[PDB]
Amino acid sequence: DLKLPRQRVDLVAPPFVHVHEQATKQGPKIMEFKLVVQEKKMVIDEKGTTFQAMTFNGSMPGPLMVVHEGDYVEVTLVNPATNTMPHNIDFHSATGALGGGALTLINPGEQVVLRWKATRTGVFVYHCAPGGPMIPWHVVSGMNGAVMVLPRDGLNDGHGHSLRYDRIYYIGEQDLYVPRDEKGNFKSYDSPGEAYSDTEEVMRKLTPTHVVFNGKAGALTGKNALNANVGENVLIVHSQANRDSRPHLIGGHGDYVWETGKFSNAPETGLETWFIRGGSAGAALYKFLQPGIYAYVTHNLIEAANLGATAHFKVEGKWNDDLMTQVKAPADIPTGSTNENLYFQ
Amino acid sequence: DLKLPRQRVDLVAPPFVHVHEQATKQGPKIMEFKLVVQEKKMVIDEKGTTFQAMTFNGSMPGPLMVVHEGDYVEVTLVNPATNTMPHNIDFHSATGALGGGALTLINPGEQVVLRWKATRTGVFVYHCAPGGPMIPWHVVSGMNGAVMVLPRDGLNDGHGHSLRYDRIYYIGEQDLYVPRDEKGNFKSYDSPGEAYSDTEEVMRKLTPTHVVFNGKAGALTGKNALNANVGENVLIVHSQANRDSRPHLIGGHGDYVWETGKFSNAPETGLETWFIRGGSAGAALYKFLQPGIYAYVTHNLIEAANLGATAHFKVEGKWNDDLMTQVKAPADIPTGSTNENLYFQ
Amino acid sequence: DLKLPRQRVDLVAPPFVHVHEQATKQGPKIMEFKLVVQEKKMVIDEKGTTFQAMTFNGSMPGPLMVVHEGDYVEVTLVNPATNTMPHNIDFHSATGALGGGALTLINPGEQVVLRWKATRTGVFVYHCAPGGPMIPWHVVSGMNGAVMVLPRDGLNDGHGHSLRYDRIYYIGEQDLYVPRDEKGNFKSYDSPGEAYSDTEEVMRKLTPTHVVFNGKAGALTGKNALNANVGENVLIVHSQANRDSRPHLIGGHGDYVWETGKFSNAPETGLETWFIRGGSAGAALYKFLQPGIYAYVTHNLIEAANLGATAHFKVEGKWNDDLMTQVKAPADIPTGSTNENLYFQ
């Protein structure tokens, strides 16, 4: 009895996002998405450590889904008979039934269809939540993604001026808890079930062994650096389903930041580092002003450099010597300089 | 020489709150409260683990005290001779003398009366603070609560519209540090004094063994679930005196959230997860739109599911199929479905 | 080809700040600062524990640099030949080249001159960032400070009223990771190089051994307490380059707080505890209303009392009995009192 145009959306693998319009004059639609659970071993660091992962659509994070305020979202969740455990899905964007968790529990070999109305604008987390201690275990094993619900008029700056992005990326950050053997080496398992008890012991101490973007250390570095151009307005959506994060664009700023991730609230301007609370998504706009390599990190630098949480942007364009310049290149300290006279010696 | 009506308030045990008016046309009063320290063993988890607790009024958290801006708050603190240690009280709502800590130090068998003026609106923490390493130890042993100072006109949305709650609850979150024996079992002690040295060693590593609401794992689940009704505006006050928290209503939102907890600042709207900084109280409004069970958690899910930090709301009313509906119940995956053709396989 | 007045600034050791104007009618200048790297052993706690530190200008934190929006900042970085490692500098206030890190790498015996334009107002972190795992190691060894870029009209309250401070202090908070021997005693090293491998193992677990303000436990207590007077508006700038902090003035409030530290955003009013995200600086105003000792802490009380993160303010003036008063000093509990009748017994 819900009589609205339907539209099928094909999701893509993060950090890219499926095609969508920002501002729209189209009325409300039923937007149809399909997610298939996949349990599999994945590599999570540059030394080749492996991990028994559980994913939506084979990726960590799950794909970003984009709809407009007032749309209805109809999700088919599929749990193929190759999987070993029950799974479900809960959307933080949705209202009732534990975000839909209470309506979507499916055994291997089954599927379910849930519909929810997109009544609140912003970016939101979605994750598996089977019940009890299964909940943290599914989420930290990789079963979490995000949804963005745009206002029909697109983003604005909270002072009645429109904001438009040229480019969008979705960075999902994941905390992982990998057991070690007596000698400190990471342990390997043949199934998720088998990893469980040792993993639980690591989770209980609340300290991750890895903190990764897009599912592995180095995933968004080297040849998979993110691309941009001087002058472009880039939206970066950042989610963390379980633990806090402090995103920082090294060499840049957050021009407009919705750190709690909800478009009904005016963004903050000109931030250096912002804060994603565990269990939420945030979004930041930035207009690149200078070419070159930028590092996008969590600004716990131990986690960024040593546990895996660094992505790269490669930005093409012309350098602006007004903003920054090397006045004098590295040179010998002058013989006639007197730094030994300074207050602190 | 302070000539104002006096009024005695009877406190109640959390998560309930003593009777009060929201908006008031009464002038400033002296509001008189009494707190009695109690040291005692308490059960803190579902396996029956016990802990040497120190409390105000026998509860963790201490009772919520509610007054209006401009009131004077006169607190009698009582330390009965059955207790073993000196205690005091500091209010984050108050100005001077370390929030009153410097005026309220009492040995067992003594009492003291402090008066402070409620000049700043919001929710605030109160806690014991005897001096030095005693401070964290008293607080994490349970000696902390909150006070709410309402504007005389009641809450507003920051755009000049009144906000009124139908129902209020106070959730105090507590981090606990319970020593373990060689074999990993939790240790038991006959006095707070005796637990001290082993507890200090656990505190120094900054990782709690339990994170509980209203003093124990499961305290606000089962038969002590919180009650509400579709349509009701519920205020949830959340405090954490020592460590950060990220509250999340599973299946719901924060309609209006004062995450730093101060009513002079306009609330944020439509949050998924909010953030209580350690050493503070926050407050969130929500109007229930759907019946059923909701879980209120910190959205570090390891802490929520495995360390104790989950409460339940049971909400009566009629389900709204517009907001959310199960279109197709769990069913076998169709033989003629082709999920093996999807981008991620 | 940049034709502007130059002005040399002499930095001073934190928590004090070099002389500057708040509001200015002067046009843009080139502001010239010099920083010299110093590697040396420092004492970091009250038991005399030592640590292989790396600093800018011999202090942890580095000096606060103050300029106005539109100024150009020209920094000479000097790495004397007594040091053992390459170092550089990155400013979060600057745009491009990893905040200048990519232009400032200097070996011992060398110096470099970088110029950046101060286009964004607020307080910002600066830190060494040589590349890879060297980055967290340099920062947590002490190589980080802050810069404040003031609006030309000075601070305002976000509702078009001017804010002026009578007094400014810079509190840099530092997380430290000191290795322990088998018996739990802190280990000593003869060089930074030698401490490295053991320090890395401690950093990987993400739990600091010390959390200190101005470079050591007790640095801003006793005879080095900070000074103020009843009636004065004091600006406290707080930075943390690597880990989150929750500042709290015990006995006071944050009258006006820029917790994300950026002056383009209206401050919050009347906070009890605020939140500095790791990798950022924040600023808070407060007008002292009462004389006496105040403690400025991070409100993780374990860290404040047990790991080193407490400073003192000593405030002169007259006590205001209206705001707070001891109505009845500590006294025996009356024989005819009946506390045994209270709801919680």
Ligand SMILES: OC[C@H]1O[C@@](CO)(O[C@H]2O[C@H](CO)[C@@H](O)[C@H](O)[C@H]2O)[C@@H](O)[C@@H]1O
């Ligand atoms: O109190 C009525 C009773 O109805 C139940 C049956 O399980 O379901 C209601 O809520 C569901 C979502 O939780 C809807 O799918 C269903 O249509 C609705 O009738 C119970 O939840 C509830 O106890």
Ligand SMILES: OC[C@H]1O[C@@](CO)(O[C@H]2O[C@H](CO)[C@@H](O)[C@H](O)[C@H]2O)[C@@H](O)[C@@H]1O
């Ligand atoms: O500098 C004056 C001197 O007076 C003291 C005496 O202890 O107390 C003042 O402040 C108290 C609260 O801290 C008030 O109770 C008292 O009435 C007031 O005179 C000292 O704190 C201070 O050194």
Ligand SMILES: OC[C@H]1O[C@@](CO)(O[C@H]2O[C@H](CO)[C@@H](O)[C@H](O)[C@H]2O)[C@@H](O)[C@@H]1O
């Ligand atoms: O793409 C052009 C090329 O120029 C380089 C040479 O290293 O430098 C540009 O950016 C520098 C700052 O990163 C400026 O100092 C320099 O003036 C500018 O030409 C490369 O970064 C870049 O690949």
Ligand SMILES: [Cu+2]
């Ligand atoms: Cu699952």
Ligand SMILES: [Cu+2]
């Ligand atoms: Cu969730």
Ligand SMILES: [Cu+2]
């Ligand atoms: Cu106490």
Ligand SMILES: [Cu+2]
């Ligand atoms: Cu406190």
Ligand SMILES: [Cu+2]
């Ligand atoms: Cu360095």
Ligand SMILES: [Cu+2]
């Ligand atoms: Cu940085």
